[PDB]
Each structure stands twice: as C-alpha cells, then as structure tokens.
Ligand binder design. Structure first.
Ligand SMILES: [Ca+2]
Ligand SMILES: [Ca+2]
Ligand SMILES: [Ca+2]
Ligand SMILES: [Ca+2]
Ligand SMILES: [Ca+2]
Ligand SMILES: [Ca+2]
Ligand SMILES: [Ca+2]
Ligand SMILES: [Ca+2]
Length: 293
DNA sequence: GGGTTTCCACTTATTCATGATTTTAG
DNA sequence: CCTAAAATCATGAATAAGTGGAAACC
C-alpha cells in the first residue's frame, strides 16, 4: 500500500484532471459532463495503478493504446476519495491549480447545477482555465466572457516521500560512459536527472537547495522549453542522492534502475571503475538498464 | 423507462525521460 | 597525463491530455 505522500508526488508527476463538457442530444440542457482524475503509464508499470486502485478502492484500469495502461477515476462518488487524499496530502506543482479547478467543478456537480444552463456556464468558465482550456467548439458555443487566467503555484518540496514519488515519475538514473584521454579511455559518470516544463522553474530550482547539490539546465525545441535538474558529482550522488532513495523507496521499474545504479556506485566507491574488469562489469550493467528503456 | 452516468477503445501534441559528445576543472 | 565534473547537443515516445461511442442503470 503506497505511502500517501509518495502517492501525491507521483500524481504531481503523472496525474491529470479532466473535465468533459460534451454536446449531448439526450441531455436536458444539451450537454453532459464527466469529471475525473487519471494516470497513464507504460504497461510495465501496471502494478502501480493496481496498487493505487487497491489503496484508494476507486478507478477503472484499461489499456491505452498498445503500450500504455490508464487508471481513470470519474465515478462521482469515487471523486470524494480523490478530494480527501489531496486535501490531506496536497499537490505542489502547477497541477495543484488544476486540482483546485477540479474541486470547483465537483462542487457545481454535487449541487446538481450541471443539469441546468447556468451550471454548464460555470463549468465552461472553469474548463477555460484547466489544462489546454476550451475547445474551438466550446469557444463557439460560449463566446461570452471567459478569462483563462489563474494563479501561479509556488510551493516547496514538503518531504522526501513526495520526492520519491515525483522521481518515480520524472526521474532518470543513468551511467554515462565518456570517451576519455584516461588510461582506460572511458570515464564512468553517474547522472541523476529530473525533467520538467519551465512553468515549474521555482520548484525545480528548489531541488538544488533541498538536496544540497546539482544544477539546473534549460533546453529548447521550437517554442517548447523544459528544465532539467542534474547531479553528477560522485560524492553528492553517493552521500546525498543514494541515501534519500534508500530510505524513501521508489515505485515502479525505476526502482530497478536505481538498484543497478547503486551497483555501479559501489564499484566506483572501491575505485573498481578504473580497472578493466570493473569497467567491463559497469558496461554490462549499463546495457541492462538502457536495454529495458 | 430515458436522461444521466460511467465505462472502454482509442487518438494527439508535446513534455518528458533518455542518450550521447564535447569541454573544463583540478 | 589523468580523472572528475560540467556543458552542450539531441530525439522518440511515454506522457499529458483528450475524443468517439455506447452500455448501464436508478
Ligand atoms: Ca509530468
Ligand atoms: Ca468501482
Ligand atoms: Ca514517467
Ligand atoms: Ca512524467
Ligand atoms: Ca534504450
Ligand atoms: Ca492534434
Ligand atoms: Ca540513459
Ligand atoms: Ca503518464
């Protein structure tokens, strides 16, 4: 049964809130609604979704395309369990803003106001601020006054369990083999990396101070920008990053990556990475990790 | 019921994870 | 020389979010 703060950190990484406002000829107001929370993962991490479903006793699990599986929670009574969790263990990325809109929509629907014109109008004003906002259709049907503005979230990491859940979503453990003018000709470097859209720069920057190490890099692709928190200094990896996740367990197959990674850190601690046999073992491990991803 | 809810198959854009080479520090 | 640390450059798909259709009641 997943620790609740690990669960929240994982939801910050992998969850999404949904609000559907659909044309419906059989609905009294011309529209039907659906509200919910979902996580979509690669099929290999299905057991996480089964563990969440069992931990919360809500949601349905289905294939999502050919390589992924989703846990989707939209049964209205199930949504109270979502609210109860995130009231006690609140999200800390910009997704908390989407949670706040989700709660506002939930309140409209709890009052059955979504079955009247004005409740539909209120849900449209809510949806305009949520995720990608109103569709063209909805913007057509509701050209009224609809601001897309909402407040920025600016929160710090609450604890290391949140961090373990978030890293189980967004983190990467890698062995970097660097062509080198070394005696062996290859430098072994361990890297820990977490990637996130630039909208959560404050949270990412706080990783530096929270963990006591690492750097932030920015990267572009056309208009699309993201940040990466990175650690490669071995003493920081060995004395700060590895202990954190030894005491705050990762979930999903990334746990296996972390375990292999630690095997290499052990070799480096003993200076075995400077030996031909140590280097060859490290190569085997890296091949095992990289193979499966 | 029949208006509403909930589920299930499936799609899409892009934010992730991932992979590598080059350079600098010491 | 030698090794560690940091910087730069890259890319495909798991995500992050969403859509079409309809069974299933209450
Ligand atoms: Ca994410
Ligand atoms: Ca159920
Ligand atoms: Ca992930
Ligand atoms: Ca993710
Ligand atoms: Ca691979
Ligand atoms: Ca599109
Ligand atoms: Ca890698
Ligand atoms: Ca996902």
């Amino acid at each position: 049964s997943i620790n609740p703060w690990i669960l929240t950190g994982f939801a910050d990484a992998e969850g999404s809130f949904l609000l559907r406002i659909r044309n419906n000829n059989k609905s009294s107001v011309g529209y039907s609604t659906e509200l919910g929370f979902q996580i979509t993962l690669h099929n290999k991490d299905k057991s996480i979704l089964e563990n969440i479903q069992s931990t919360w006793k809500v949601g349905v699990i289905a294939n999502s395309g050919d390589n992924a599986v989703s846990l989707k929670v939209t049964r209205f009574e199930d949504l109270k369990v979502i609210i109860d969790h995130f009231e006690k263990y609140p999200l800390i990325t910009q997704k908390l803003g989407d949670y706040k809109l989700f709660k506002q929509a939930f309140s409209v629907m709890e009052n059955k106001e979504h079955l009247k014109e004005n409740g539909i109008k209120e849900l449209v004003r809510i949806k305009a601020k949520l995720n990608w906002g109103l569709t063209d259709e909805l913007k057509k049907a509701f050209p009224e006054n609809i601001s897309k503005e909402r407040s920025l979230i600016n929160k710090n990491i609450p604890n290391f369990k949140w961090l373990a859940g978030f890293t189980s979503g967004e983190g990467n453990f890698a062995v970097n083999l660097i062509k080198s003018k070394s005696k062996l000709g290859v430098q072994v470097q361990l890297t820990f990396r977490i990637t996130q859209h630039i909208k959560d720069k404050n949270l990412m920057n706080s990783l530096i101070t929270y963990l006591g190490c690492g750097y932030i890099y920015e990267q572009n692709k056309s208009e699309f920008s993201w940040l990466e928190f990175r650690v490669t200094k071995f003493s920081d990896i060995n004395d700060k990053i590895i202990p954190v996740f030894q005491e705050n367990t990762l979930i999903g197959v990334k746990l296996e990556d972390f375990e292999d990674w630690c095997k290499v850190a052990k070799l480096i601690e003993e200076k075995k990475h400077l030996t031909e046999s140590g280097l060859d073992e490290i190569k085997k491990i890296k091949l095992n990790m990289n193979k499966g991803r």
